[PDB]
Design an enzyme around this catalytic site. Sequence first.
Site, PDB file in Angstrom:
ATOM      1  N   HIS A  12      42.987  38.034  34.279  1.00 39.26           N
ATOM      2  CA  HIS A  12      42.521  36.701  33.956  1.00 39.26           C
ATOM      3  C   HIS A  12      43.636  36.016  33.228  1.00 39.26           C
ATOM      4  CE1 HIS A  12      37.870  36.834  34.298  1.00 39.26           C
ATOM      5  NE2 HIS A  12      38.366  37.827  35.012  1.00 39.26           N
ATOM      6  N   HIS A  36      37.890  35.936  44.880  1.00 38.25           N
ATOM      7  CA  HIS A  36      36.427  36.215  44.209  1.00 38.25           C
ATOM      8  C   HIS A  36      35.218  35.247  44.307  1.00 38.25           C
ATOM      9  CE1 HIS A  36      36.809  32.777  41.143  1.00 38.25           C
ATOM     10  NE2 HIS A  36      37.540  32.423  42.184  1.00 38.25           N
ATOM     11  N   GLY A  37      34.531  35.198  45.435  1.00 35.02           N
ATOM     12  CA  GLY A  37      33.462  33.993  45.138  1.00 35.02           C
ATOM     13  C   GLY A  37      33.902  32.587  44.709  1.00 35.02           C
ATOM     14  N   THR A  38      33.040  31.607  44.949  1.00 40.19           N
ATOM     15  CA  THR A  38      33.348  30.198  44.687  1.00 40.19           C
ATOM     16  C   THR A  38      32.991  29.695  43.285  1.00 40.19           C
ATOM     17  OG1 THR A  38      32.502  27.978  45.172  1.00 40.19           O
ATOM     18  CG2 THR A  38      31.278  29.861  46.074  1.00 40.19           C
ATOM     19  N   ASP A  74      41.495  29.652  44.723  1.00 31.68           N
ATOM     20  CA  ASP A  74      40.177  29.567  44.132  1.00 31.68           C
ATOM     21  C   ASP A  74      39.222  28.625  44.875  1.00 31.68           C
ATOM     22  OD1 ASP A  74      40.836  30.154  40.550  1.00 31.68           O
ATOM     23  OD2 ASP A  74      40.460  31.504  42.239  1.00 31.68           O
ATOM     24  N   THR A  95      30.398  36.614  41.839  1.00 34.62           N
ATOM     25  CA  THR A  95      29.007  36.328  42.142  1.00 34.62           C
ATOM     26  C   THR A  95      28.950  35.381  43.324  1.00 34.62           C
ATOM     27  OG1 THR A  95      28.350  36.553  39.827  1.00 34.62           O
ATOM     28  CG2 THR A  95      26.842  35.395  41.301  1.00 34.62           C
ATOM     29  N   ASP A 124      45.966  33.316  42.878  1.00 29.91           N
ATOM     30  CA  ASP A 124      45.220  33.546  44.130  1.00 29.91           C
ATOM     31  C   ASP A 124      44.711  32.180  44.619  1.00 29.91           C
ATOM     32  OD1 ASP A 124      43.188  32.854  42.404  1.00 29.91           O
ATOM     33  OD2 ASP A 124      42.222  34.804  42.360  1.00 29.91           O
TER      34      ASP A 124
HETATM   35  N1  LIG Z   1      31.150  34.818  40.501  1.00 29.30           N
HETATM   36  C1  LIG Z   1      32.178  34.023  40.293  1.00 29.30           C
HETATM   37  N2  LIG Z   1      32.593  33.114  41.229  1.00 29.30           N
HETATM   38  C2  LIG Z   1      33.641  32.253  41.106  1.00 29.30           C
HETATM   39  N3  LIG Z   1      34.387  32.239  39.970  1.00 29.30           N
HETATM   40  C3  LIG Z   1      33.940  33.136  39.112  1.00 29.30           C
HETATM   41  C4  LIG Z   1      32.913  34.049  39.110  1.00 29.30           C
HETATM   42  N4  LIG Z   1      32.815  34.793  37.982  1.00 29.30           N
HETATM   43  C5  LIG Z   1      33.808  34.314  37.290  1.00 29.30           C
HETATM   44  N5  LIG Z   1      34.573  33.283  37.901  1.00 29.30           N
HETATM   45  C6  LIG Z   1      35.756  32.767  37.027  1.00 29.30           C
HETATM   46  O1  LIG Z   1      36.448  31.539  36.710  1.00 29.30           O
HETATM   47  C7  LIG Z   1      37.828  31.955  36.554  1.00 29.30           C
HETATM   48  C8  LIG Z   1      38.894  31.208  37.361  1.00 29.30           C
HETATM   49  O2  LIG Z   1      40.123  31.920  37.018  1.00 29.30           O
HETATM   50  P1  LIG Z   1      40.218  33.371  37.483  1.00 29.30           P
HETATM   51  O3  LIG Z   1      40.064  33.396  38.967  1.00 29.30           O
HETATM   52  O4  LIG Z   1      41.520  34.019  37.073  1.00 29.30           O
HETATM   53  O5  LIG Z   1      39.115  34.010  36.688  1.00 29.30           O
HETATM   54  C9  LIG Z   1      37.843  33.431  36.910  1.00 29.30           C
HETATM   55  C10 LIG Z   1      36.576  33.842  36.219  1.00 29.30           C
HETATM   56  O6  LIG Z   1      36.653  33.795  34.812  1.00 29.30           O
HETATM   57 YB   LIG Z   2      42.985  33.597  40.501  1.00 22.24          YB
HETATM   58 YB   LIG Z   3      39.352  32.410  40.986  1.00 21.91          YB
HETATM   59 YB   LIG Z   4      40.832  33.338  41.013  1.00 18.93          YB
END
Ligand SMILES: Nc1ncnc2c1ncn2[C@@H]1O[C@@H]2COP(=O)(O)O[C@H]2[C@H]1O
Ligand SMILES: [Yb+3]
Ligand SMILES: [Yb+3]
Ligand SMILES: [Yb+3]
EC number: 4.6.1.1
Lengths: 481, 143
Positions: free
Chosen positions: A60, A286-288, A202, A257, A200
């Site tokens: 993070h 990771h998810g939106t 987002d 999530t 990455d």
């Molecule tokens: N389920 C999720 N879906 C999308 N973003 C998330 C979720 N859980 C956390 N995020 C976040 O929002 C942040 C955006 O920066 P990061 O991707 O480094 O780290 C991520 C998390 O702290």
């Molecule tokens: Yb990221």
């Molecule tokens: Yb992210």
């Molecule tokens: Yb990310």
Amino acid sequence: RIDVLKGEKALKASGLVPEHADAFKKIARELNTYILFRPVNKLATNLIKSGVATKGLNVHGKSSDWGPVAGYIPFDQDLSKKHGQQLAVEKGNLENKKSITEHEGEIGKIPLKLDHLRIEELKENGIILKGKKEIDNGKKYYLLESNNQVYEFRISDENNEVQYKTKEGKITVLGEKFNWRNIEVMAKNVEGVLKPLTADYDLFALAPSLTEIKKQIPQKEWDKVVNTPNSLEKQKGVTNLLIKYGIERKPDSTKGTLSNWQKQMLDRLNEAVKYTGYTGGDVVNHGTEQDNEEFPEKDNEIFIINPEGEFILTKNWEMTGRFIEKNITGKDYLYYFNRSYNKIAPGNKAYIEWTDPITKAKINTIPTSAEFIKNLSSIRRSKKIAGYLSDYYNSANHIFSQEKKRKISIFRGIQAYNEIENVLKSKQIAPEYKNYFQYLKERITNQVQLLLTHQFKLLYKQLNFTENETDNFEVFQKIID
Amino acid sequence: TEEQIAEFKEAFSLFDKDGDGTITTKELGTVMRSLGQNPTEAELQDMINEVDADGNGTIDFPEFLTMMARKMKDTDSEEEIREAFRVFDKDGNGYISAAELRHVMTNLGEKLTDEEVDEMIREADIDGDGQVNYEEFVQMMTA
Ligand SMILES: Nc1ncnc2c1ncn2[C@@H]1O[C@@H]2COP(=O)(O)O[C@H]2[C@H]1O
Ligand SMILES: [Yb+3]
Ligand SMILES: [Yb+3]
Ligand SMILES: [Yb+3]
Ligand SMILES: [Ca+2]
């Protein structure tokens, strides 16, 4: 019309690697779903194209958009884009510390090595310039230049590892002053070797066509609620299938999530990029953003790839939300917005506004019982009305005709307007709650006065004041027409 | 969650001359009804008769506050729903309209007759204004 950026001028402003944004149209048109990305550290782009691995959720650490470590994620997050805000940098570190320790093995850190090729890249974006020739204890270095007023850097003519120190006099965010040490960057373990991480992609949101959620629902499981003899709960079963294979998002553990049409999506997007030769695994991972409730984030520009392969780039939140309003949530696509919008996000105390249609139409609709208790709940800083509200919304009106419905309801509605007056005329107890029943009134008032806008504008100084039982409803029988 | 708890308490001050919070199994639901979920007399005789069953079935806090922990668990919706609403409501009017339901249905794959749609709105309708407001969509989705 809206002042938005279209075409190359947008992809360019999205930070997304062009060769990938291209592979993305493919999936956007193919699955008839809009694909909206948040920004992407631009100095991170060619690094990604190069093949640099991208940070997951176990990292993070905000990457850096400045200095020679720009693009990568400096272990000392005071070299990253947060450079300056203490509590921020302080959290940046802890987060990286948690990465190295809580993941010994998967995550680590390597020294920053800028090659004759990355120096150039940085040179063009005008990030850092290769300077003089310095010689310290038998090894040669070249002071890497930067418009920064706190640190100084260099590169070794030997291994190409960058080092940095605090300038004379100046002091670090934390209160530290040190000397020539290595800029360490967050790494990822791949096959026994330690490789460096980078920004990455987002996803800000993923909106498919409702017609798309269908294919997700089992052509069985559907026919049941569909062919239901009824016509009441039949809707519930339709909505509830929409809710299951359309929404109720769950923990993956690594992906964050998201849903299942989102997990499948993610993979499609990553397969896409991998086919363009990207050696470095997943790019979207990771998810939106709409499920990121704890620490939500508002960016001014959101890159969008519509189901037509077109590139748009809203220029401001007011716009990004106006776009989605017109092109997505009002054109038959599935879309949901962050639960923590319009609220005070807990994790970061964030306050992101968004238009929630259910609120617009609130001043004309009277609250249910529970809604009335909750309203009694989160205001407990420092009776019996809940009934007349579970009366208004009596799901057992489903046998009545609108005419009747609109009546008993207009009544049950004034019924409560009563109890909610027997108080404002009682002991003054708390000016906090009084400022609520006033609302109810105006609300309870507005709804009734909206039903009657079919058949009143003062019919209250006559109707049943103070008796009870069933005779009251009788008097009403005529007070009406 | 926490709020899915703090609320409840408010109910324990509505109608029970017991004073120190103490109703009975002859007026337990009178609270659940006025609250959320709505079970029948059959789903209320065996749930309660388990945790606190002495002589007069003492009813208080560590009890009810525990019963919901399984009934109001899988149905942790409310959110999983309030968003379903926003989907049918492509207009932004705040209320679901006949059309609003067609458009959504004709896409989930089931071509609805211009008749039915107008029947699903009416039945689902409660206050009888001709369209479903959120509150109604809630009710229509649980009770
Ligand atoms: N389920 C999720 N879906 C999308 N973003 C998330 C979720 N859980 C956390 N995020 C976040 O929002 C942040 C955006 O920066 P990061 O991707 O480094 O780290 C991520 C998390 O702290
Ligand atoms: Yb990221
Ligand atoms: Yb992210
Ligand atoms: Yb990310
Ligand atoms: Ca209605």
